[PDB]
Nucleic acid binder design. Structure first.
Ligand SMILES: [K+]
Ligand SMILES: [K+]
Ligand SMILES: [Mg+2]
Ligand SMILES: [Mg+2]
Ligand SMILES: [Mg+2]
Ligand SMILES: [Mg+2]
Ligand SMILES: [Mg+2]
Ligand SMILES: [Mg+2]
Ligand SMILES: [Mg+2]
Ligand SMILES: [Mg+2]
Ligand SMILES: [Mg+2]
Ligand SMILES: [Mg+2]
Ligand SMILES: [Mg+2]
Ligand SMILES: [Mg+2]
Ligand SMILES: [Mg+2]
Ligand SMILES: [Mg+2]
Ligand SMILES: [Mg+2]
Ligand SMILES: [Mg+2]
Ligand SMILES: [Mg+2]
Ligand SMILES: [Mg+2]
Ligand SMILES: [Mg+2]
Ligand SMILES: [Mg+2]
Ligand SMILES: [Mg+2]
Ligand SMILES: [Mg+2]
Ligand SMILES: [Mg+2]
Ligand SMILES: [Mg+2]
Ligand SMILES: [Mg+2]
Ligand SMILES: [Mg+2]
Ligand SMILES: [Mg+2]
Ligand SMILES: [Mg+2]
Ligand SMILES: [Mg+2]
Ligand SMILES: [Mg+2]
Ligand SMILES: [Mg+2]
Ligand SMILES: [Mg+2]
Ligand SMILES: [Mg+2]
Ligand SMILES: [Mg+2]
Ligand SMILES: [Mg+2]
Ligand SMILES: [Mg+2]
Ligand SMILES: [Mg+2]
Ligand SMILES: [Mg+2]
Ligand SMILES: [Mg+2]
Ligand SMILES: [Mg+2]
Ligand SMILES: [Mg+2]
Ligand SMILES: [Mg+2]
Ligand SMILES: [Mg+2]
Ligand SMILES: [Mg+2]
Ligand SMILES: [Mg+2]
Ligand SMILES: [Mg+2]
Ligand SMILES: [Mg+2]
Ligand SMILES: [Mg+2]
Ligand SMILES: [Zn+2]
Lengths: 119, 57, 46, 192, 36, 235
RNA sequence: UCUUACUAUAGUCAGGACUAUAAAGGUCCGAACGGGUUAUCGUUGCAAAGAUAUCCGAAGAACUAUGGUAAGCGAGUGAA
RNA sequence: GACAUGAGUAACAAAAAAGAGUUUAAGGUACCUAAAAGGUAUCUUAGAGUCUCGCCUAAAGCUUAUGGCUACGUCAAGUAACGGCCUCUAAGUUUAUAAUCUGAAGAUUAUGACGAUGAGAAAACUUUGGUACCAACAUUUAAAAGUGAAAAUUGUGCAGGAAGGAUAAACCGUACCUAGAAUCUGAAACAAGUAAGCUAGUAGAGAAUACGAAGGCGUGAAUGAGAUAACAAUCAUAAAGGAACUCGGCAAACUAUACCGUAACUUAGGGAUAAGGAGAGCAUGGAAUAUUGUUGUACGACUGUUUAAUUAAAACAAAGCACUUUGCAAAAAGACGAUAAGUCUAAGUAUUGAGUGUGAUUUCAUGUAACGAUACAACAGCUGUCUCUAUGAUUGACUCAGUGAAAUUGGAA
RNA sequence: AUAACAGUUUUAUUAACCUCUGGUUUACCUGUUGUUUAUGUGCCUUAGGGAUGUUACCGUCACUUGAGUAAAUACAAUAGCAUAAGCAUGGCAGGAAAGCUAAGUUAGUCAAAAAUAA
């Protein structure tokens, strides 16, 4: 459950470390794993994204527990995301971390083609 | 209140469906025969038996 | 509104202000006595 | 809007309600009977029947939980695990009897009851059933099925049983306790 | 300090609390006087 | 935590039956103490003369008693001898117009002050057991438990009759460790002589019986000088 | 006898910290005491100025007690 | 003036709290009994007490004041263990006397008298001016040790700390009440207010915080028993997010020992506890300490004061500074005096007094250190402010028994 | 033609419902701090003595403690220990089924027809 003013982690090599959610795209319900959002870069890492740049992102990890169709419920220790452009193409090129398994059923093959781990 | 309630509209509120109901669940007491409420213990035999068990025992 | 202006009041200040000797012994206090006396007051002071 | 009440709150605080129930169960053992309101007699009835169930256990935990309900354990525990334990040894539950009574306080007219220990020295249904039997024998009447049904209830698990019941009847007739009792055959001719 | 500094702990005359400790005259019957 | 006794018949060490409950008299509940089997106990660690005489003062109106080793009581005695018996029932000070000497006890031994310091202890321990632990007056005699808390506090203050019964008991060997006993242990024992001075001859009749080692005298030394005359029954 | 100022005679301010002092400071934290910052309740109130929490001063231009003086054509008192 | 309506409605809710027995007096009923009586049970009114539970506790306890529409058997030569009366005087008062001023009334000065909130011989028996003084603060001292007074000893700072008298038992007070349970003030039985002493113990630096020994209380039916809707008040907890709420972080939440190391700035005192490193089981565990923090601006140097009871501040005051005035030879100027004598100024004298504006210091209106329940902004954390509410607790609301208002109303189908 | 295996939307809104995921939990279990009360037990030595505790006296201007002076004693004892309960926000902390609940689950809209407008 990601809303406005929520701070998330960027796990791709885009040069963003800490982004803040500014809008849940396409829905009124708060963004969960695999949902598209618009974020604002709040920090960087020592064509990178400068602090204050507004980009679209995808939620990959949520601290809120998420119930799968089989009754499996997954929970992560923090909220993460990967920056994407309005087209839907990852801005970065490599993911460092574990993403949720809900990206497979929501057609995010591009994020899943960067060899991210899954839980 | 904007006006004074008349004798009619005040008598409706006071007595229309507010008549005291007659208690009809009364039975006699087996030990003494006195009238008591149903499913209840006689008040005159309770005190007498309650006092009879305090003297001798 | 009214205030509790008689809280902590002592009966020694009542005799020094509105007592009988505060009135017979002053020119302005002799008038108050005669007025209350001419009206019929029993309580000329205090 | 929320859930229903699990039990009666009796318009008291949490701690005040746990002390009210421990005092009624303390007076019930000490006095074998108590005359209180009906909602109070029905809330302590569940705590008095669970305290006598602990008195029928051989573990020490039950001996420590019985100490945590009474308010003078040093003086009342010997009675709990003594006389009372022997009394209710063979009874499968149902050690208390709550009988509705006329208001104990006439000011508020609050319905009252009598919480008592069955087969006890002050069992009010054992005496009321003995007075009915005393009147029936002393008036050459035939006991009703409800009198016969109550005569066996108050003599089945009691130690002496029928012998203790016949002695009560004998003591109520030699005292002339049934003097002035309206015969059951003249109840249909009485209005007042 | 092992002593109890509240000498008259739980000690009252109106409620007949009894002596706090055992005295040398505690094992005898109280002398009964002739009333006034 | 306190432990109250019950009004049950018990044995006494005194020679007389102090109370009707007393079963036996002159019973040895403990071997004689160090100074009990001593012909001449001495004023070892106390001032000269201390213990030779003991005074008793009483409220002539309410009946409250105070024991003192000196001929005059002070504010200490009123605090250390009068327990709380109700609101408006414990005086805030000693009023000279109410407190008078009730009696005075003088021993034969003019330098054996250790015997009076023992008589003083049993009198003060008996008085504490009269204001507290009064189970013998709860349902009999004055019936203090059948009275209101206000009237119960007034009767608990009236310790004058009780104090005179503590004198006939203490001066007859009541108490354990009482030094009024004299054991020879050559084993015959006896009581030491004593003299009680009374301001009122009628006050000595609160004790149902007095021992044979006490002599009664009227008038307390120093009371006539105060223009206070003793009350005599014979007149 | 309220209240403002003054006046005489008296009383009170747990404990701790810092500072040059044992005691020299309109010093510091914080009870009693004195204030009344913010919010809520209350508004035919418990109260014709209260309750709760929060907040400020708390050895000083401090606070308190019992008396005294100064007020109504002019204006007594007024850190206003 | 009487009697209606609202209405048998609101209210009898200080977040202490009740439970079950017992008993006394008078009287009402039912039965027993018909010789009236007496006995058993029960109810009404007015009491009392026992066992258990809880509440206050540096009090809601005890001893006493101010005071009192509570009640009248409250008892003293003095000290221990007592005040008044009485003696002495302060601030002051004076229809006392003398003098003086004055349209009358009156006012002034001196003397006298009077006036406590102060000072007054002895007693566990008694009748000169630091060779100083008895303001504040600090220190020492009744010898086994500690603590609190009393009085005195010594000393410190400046703000420089009364007056006068002396040195055989009369008369008056004494009861009760101290504000959470029947009494004072608030129109009253009001959740407010009111003086002094004591005010168990444990644990503490402590009168903090927590428990509570004794004591009191858990109201004069001015209430009691139920039930536990909406909603309100006061609270508890809370997934994910963390100001997205809102005029505004309003409210709420977070904030956590004699330790190593501490910046710009600075009036050299501070800033500063800066910051930064750290103190058997889930937890060395409750309460209080304990609060958003930091930084930067505007205004005012600062601590203080202000519209009792809607404005606490930037306003008033303030130390410092500046200017005008005042030579005292009979009245220094200023203030006061139906109007004077005269009083304050002042037992002062140009570094005195009064008036006026400014408002430390620095630079000569303006820039810093410090300080602020002032106003505002940013940053970090924090949270039910919000996304978006849910649940739980108590007290009302609701029903039964008792008691019983108010605004309002031309008449009303 | 079978058998086995695998794949077959989103958003919004309305209502119901607790299987799941959570929230709550004021008479459930466990742990635990401060303090009080009751009960039980409770030191050394050869019934006695001693340690601690108790009462009285001595003493002080007064209070407490110690010494000293007498006596009693776990028999009704001290500190400690055991059990239980009270109070401190349900004292606090970790869990928690039922009930209620949304952020959770499921369902309608997301089956169909007639007569009409331009
Ligand atoms: K402060
Ligand atoms: K004139
Ligand atoms: Mg006014
Ligand atoms: Mg006043
Ligand atoms: Mg209620
Ligand atoms: Mg509690
Ligand atoms: Mg008195
Ligand atoms: Mg005044
Ligand atoms: Mg200060
Ligand atoms: Mg400050
Ligand atoms: Mg003010
Ligand atoms: Mg309102
Ligand atoms: Mg209505
Ligand atoms: Mg209503
Ligand atoms: Mg109501
Ligand atoms: Mg009767
Ligand atoms: Mg406190
Ligand atoms: Mg009155
Ligand atoms: Mg006198
Ligand atoms: Mg004079
Ligand atoms: Mg005086
Ligand atoms: Mg009040
Ligand atoms: Mg109060
Ligand atoms: Mg009043
Ligand atoms: Mg009281
Ligand atoms: Mg009550
Ligand atoms: Mg939350
Ligand atoms: Mg959370
Ligand atoms: Mg908005
Ligand atoms: Mg906003
Ligand atoms: Mg706030
Ligand atoms: Mg300022
Ligand atoms: Mg104002
Ligand atoms: Mg204000
Ligand atoms: Mg300047
Ligand atoms: Mg001049
Ligand atoms: Mg200015
Ligand atoms: Mg300026
Ligand atoms: Mg200020
Ligand atoms: Mg009603
Ligand atoms: Mg599908
Ligand atoms: Mg569920
Ligand atoms: Mg279920
Ligand atoms: Mg339990
Ligand atoms: Mg308790
Ligand atoms: Mg408490
Ligand atoms: Mg818990
Ligand atoms: Mg559940
Ligand atoms: Mg369908
Ligand atoms: Mg068609
Ligand atoms: Zn019957």
């Amino acid at each position: 459950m990601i809303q406005l003013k929520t701070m998330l982690n960027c796990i791709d090599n885009s040069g963003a470390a800490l982004v803040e959610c500014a809008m849940v795209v396409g829905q009124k319900r708060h963004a969960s794993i695999g949902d598209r959002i618009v974020v604002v870069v709040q920090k960087q890492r020592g064509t990178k994204v400068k602090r204050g740049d507004i980009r679209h992102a995808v939620v990959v990890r949520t601290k809120q527990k998420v119930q799968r169709r089989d009754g499996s419920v997954v929970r992560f220790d923090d909220n993460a995301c990967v920056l994407i452009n309005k087209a839907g193409d990852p801005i970065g090129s490599r993911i460092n971390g574990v993403v949720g398994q809900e990206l497979r059923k929501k057609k995010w093959s591009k994020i899943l083609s960067m060899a991210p781990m899954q839980a | 209140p904007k006006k004074k309630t008349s004798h009619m509209k005040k008598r409706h509120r006071q007595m229309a469906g507010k008549a005291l109901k007659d208690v009809t669940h009364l039975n006699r007491c087996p030990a003494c025969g006195n009238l008591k409420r149903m499913h209840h213990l006689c008040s005159t035999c309770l005190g007498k038996l309650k006092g009879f068990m305090d003297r001798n025992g | 509104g009214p205030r509790p202006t008689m809280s902590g009041a002592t009966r020694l200040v009542q005799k020094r202000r509105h007592g009988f000797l505060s009135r017979v012994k002053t020119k302005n206090g002799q008038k108050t006595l005669k007025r209350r006396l001419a009206k019929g007051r029993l309580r000329l002071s205090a | 809007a929320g859930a229903h009440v699990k039990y009666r709150h009796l318009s008291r605080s949490s701690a005040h309600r746990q002390a009210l129930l421990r005092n009624l169960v303390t007076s019930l053992i000490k006095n074998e009977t108590i005359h209180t309101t009906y909602p109070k007699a029905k809330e302590a009835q569940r705590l008095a029947e669970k305290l006598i169930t602990l008195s029928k256990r051989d573990t020490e935990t039950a001996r420590r939980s019985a100490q945590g309900i009474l308010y003078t354990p040093d003086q009342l525990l010997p009675k709990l695990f003594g006389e009372i334990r022997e009394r209710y040894a063979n009874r499968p539950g149902g050690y208390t009897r709550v009988l509705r009574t006329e208001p104990k306080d006439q000011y508020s007219q609050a319905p009252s009851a009598i919480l008592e220990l069955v087969d006890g020295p002050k069992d009010m249904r054992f005496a009321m059933t003995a007075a009915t039997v005393a009147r029936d024998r002393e008036q050459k009447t035939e006991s009703t099925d409800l009198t016969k049904k109550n005569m066996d209830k108050v003599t089945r698990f009691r130690k002496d049983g029928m012998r203790a019941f016949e002695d009560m009847v004998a003591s109520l007739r030699d005292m002339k306790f049934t003097a002035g009792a309206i015969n059951p055959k003249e109840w249909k001719k009485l209005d007042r | 300090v092992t002593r109890d500094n509240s000498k008259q702990r739980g000690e009252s005359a109106l409620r007949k609390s009894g002596t706090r400790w055992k005295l040398s005259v505690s094992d005898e019957p109280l002398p009964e006087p002739v009333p006034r | 935590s306190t432990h109250p006794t019950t009004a049950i018949p018990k044995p006494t060490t005194a020679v007389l039956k102090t109370s009707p409950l007393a079963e036996e008299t002159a019973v040895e509940l403990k071997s004689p103490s160090r100074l009990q089997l001593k012909s001449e106990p001495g004023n070892k660690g106390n001032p000269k003369g201390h213990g030779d005489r003991i005074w008793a003062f009483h409220h002539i109106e309410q009946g409250q008693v105070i024991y003192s080793t000196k001929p005059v009581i002070s504010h200490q005695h009123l605090i250390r001898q009068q327990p709380f018996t109700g609101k408006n029932l414990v005086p805030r000070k000693i009023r000279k117009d109410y407190w008078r000497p009730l009696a005075m006890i003088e021993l034969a031994g003019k330098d054996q002050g250790a015997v009076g310091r023992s008589v003083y202890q049993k009198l003060r321990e008996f008085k504490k057991r009269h204001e507290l632990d009064w189970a013998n007056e709860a349902e009999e005699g004055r019936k203090l438990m059948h009275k209101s808390k206000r009237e119960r506090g007034q009767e608990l203050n009236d310790q004058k009759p009780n104090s005179v019964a503590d004198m006939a008991a203490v001066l007859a060997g009541a108490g354990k460790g009482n030094l009024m006993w004299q054991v020879s242990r050559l084993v015959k024992r006896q009581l030491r002589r004593a003299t009680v001075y009374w301001t009122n001859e009628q006050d000595k009749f609160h004790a149902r019986e007095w021992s044979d080692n006490v002599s009664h005298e009227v008038g307390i030394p120093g009371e006539a000088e105060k223009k206070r005359m003793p009350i005599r029954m014979s007149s």
